[PDB]
Design an enzyme around this catalytic site. Structure first.
Site, PDB file in Angstrom:
ATOM      1  N   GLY A  25       0.687  -1.305   0.000  1.00 44.73           N
ATOM      2  CA  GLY A  25       0.000   0.000   0.000  1.00 44.73           C
ATOM      3  C   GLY A  25       0.717   1.362   0.000  1.00 44.73           C
ATOM      4  O   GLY A  25       0.254   2.292   0.671  1.00 44.73           O
ATOM      5  N   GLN A  26       1.820   1.512  -0.745  1.00 43.85           N
ATOM      6  CA  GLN A  26       2.419   2.854  -1.046  1.00 43.85           C
ATOM      7  C   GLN A  26       2.934   3.626   0.184  1.00 43.85           C
ATOM      8  O   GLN A  26       3.506   3.036   1.116  1.00 43.85           O
ATOM      9  CB  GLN A  26       1.429   3.733  -1.837  1.00 43.85           C
ATOM     10  N   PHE A  27       0.584   0.947   5.512  1.00 44.06           N
ATOM     11  CA  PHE A  27       1.052   0.772   6.885  1.00 44.06           C
ATOM     12  C   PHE A  27       2.570   1.087   7.031  1.00 44.06           C
ATOM     13  O   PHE A  27       3.101   1.891   6.260  1.00 44.06           O
ATOM     14  CB  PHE A  27       0.690  -0.639   7.358  1.00 44.06           C
ATOM     15  N   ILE A  30       6.354  -2.745   6.203  1.00 46.26           N
ATOM     16  CA  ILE A  30       5.647  -3.984   6.056  1.00 46.26           C
ATOM     17  C   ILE A  30       5.772  -4.368   4.587  1.00 46.26           C
ATOM     18  O   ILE A  30       5.321  -3.620   3.721  1.00 46.26           O
ATOM     19  CB  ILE A  30       4.150  -3.825   6.423  1.00 46.26           C
ATOM     20  CG1 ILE A  30       3.994  -3.432   7.904  1.00 46.26           C
ATOM     21  CG2 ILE A  30       3.386  -5.101   6.081  1.00 46.26           C
ATOM     22  CD1 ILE A  30       2.556  -3.248   8.369  1.00 46.26           C
ATOM     23  N   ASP A 156      -7.773  -0.324  21.281  1.00 48.00           N
ATOM     24  CA  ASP A 156      -7.827   0.556  20.128  1.00 48.00           C
ATOM     25  C   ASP A 156      -8.649   0.048  18.950  1.00 48.00           C
ATOM     26  O   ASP A 156      -8.215   0.164  17.819  1.00 48.00           O
ATOM     27  CB  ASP A 156      -6.405   0.895  19.691  1.00 48.00           C
ATOM     28  CG  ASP A 156      -6.308   2.207  18.945  1.00 48.00           C
ATOM     29  OD1 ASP A 156      -7.314   2.900  18.790  1.00 48.00           O
ATOM     30  OD2 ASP A 156      -5.203   2.539  18.507  1.00 48.00           O
TER      31      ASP A 156
END
Length: 318
Positions: A25-26, A27, A30, A156
């Site tokens: 994704g460019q 989290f 990772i 959370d």
């Protein structure tokens, strides 16, 4: 800093071999990861490797949680005894120590997921259907009961920490245990007080009254966080959402609305879905150290499904 050479083989503490692929994704740091083989790690890889410097506190906390509570067979055993379709606790595959450029790093291999719920929520104009919220919440109750019974509290819960199974859009998983908290080490509940080791308060719009009061999180706080998520998901809003820069405002609002749940329903919803009010009233009854009756919370939610002419068929409807 590049922590890996892309395509390198890394060996974990149990001598299992893995290969490293590209970042997701460019989290955080990772990368996609797979079993060692002669193929490159593809975009459909089934694992990820999370890597942080070895003196990183949260990865160590997370690793410990996964080793203690998310061992593939520990989860499978629970699933069989409880007659669950699945359990949304990600599987732990291994971990190790990796040195690069005279720096020491820790790595951890985990399940690879598809999209987070926050992205899907925003693509649906910040609403989830009543059917969706109840089905998600039932599975989150399964997950919370599991981690609580293994001495941890998440603290959370939010849509950005809820990921879909890569192969199955109807199965949701709770991730991120870097600030998870072992409320009950060796069966001894923490006292109503601050933990000096811990510094985190959760996410301000969703966090519990206990967290706002500066005490360590416990089981009731997790259930309370889920309550606020449900309202946000159903309505697009929470009452205190324009004052998040002011924690004491947010705490004051939460305290007042807990004391008068019918006014929360009036503020957030004309007619409110009754399971939500019932859910929050049951949570309000809980003492700080008290074990929730999880099956009664699930029952309350099942009665919501009955009320819309549906059933717990495991369909998220996303």
């Amino acid at each position: 800093a590049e922590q890996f050479a892309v395509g390198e083989i890394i060996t974990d503490m149990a001598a299992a071999a893995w290969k490293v692929g590209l970042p997701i994704g460019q989290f955080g740091c990772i990368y996609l990861a797979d079993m060692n083989s002669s193929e490159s790690v593809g975009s459909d890889a089934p694992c990820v490797v999370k890597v942080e410097p070895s003196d990183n506190g949260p990865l160590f906390t997370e690793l410990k949680f996964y080793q203690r509570a998310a061992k593939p067979e520990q989860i499978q055993k629970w699933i069989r005894t409880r007659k669950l379709k699945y359990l949304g606790v990600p599987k732990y595959w291994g971990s190790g120590l990796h040195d690069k450029n005279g720096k020491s790093y820790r790595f951890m291999i985990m399940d690879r997921f598809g999209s987070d719920l926050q992205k899907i929520y925003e693509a649906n104009a910040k609403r989830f259907s009543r059917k969706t919220v109840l089905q998600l919440s039932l599975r989150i109750l399964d997950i919370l009961e599991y981690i609580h019974e293994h001495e941890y509290v998440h603290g959370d819960i939010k849509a950005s920490n809820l990921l879909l199974n890569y192969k199955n859009p109807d199965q949701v998983y709770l991730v991120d245990y870097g600030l998870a908290y072992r409320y009950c080490p060796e069966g001894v509940h923490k006292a109503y007080a601050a933990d000096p080791k811990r510094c985190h308060d959760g996410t301000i719009e969703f966090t519990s009254i206990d967290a706002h009061n500066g005490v360590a999180p416990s089981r009731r706080g997790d259930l309370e966080i889920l309550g606020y998520c449900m309202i946000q998901w159903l309505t697009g809003h929470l009452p205190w959402e324009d004052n998040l820069k002011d924690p004491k405002y947010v705490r004051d609002s939460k305290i007042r609305y807990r004391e008068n749940i019918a006014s929360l329903m009036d503020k957030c919803f004309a007619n409110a879905p009754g399971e939500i009010a019932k859910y929050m009233e049951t949570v309000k009854l809980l003492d700080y150290t008290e074990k929730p009756l999880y099956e009664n919370l699930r029952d309350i939610l099942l009665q919501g499904l009955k009320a819309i002419g549906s059933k717990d068929d495991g369909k998220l409807d996303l």
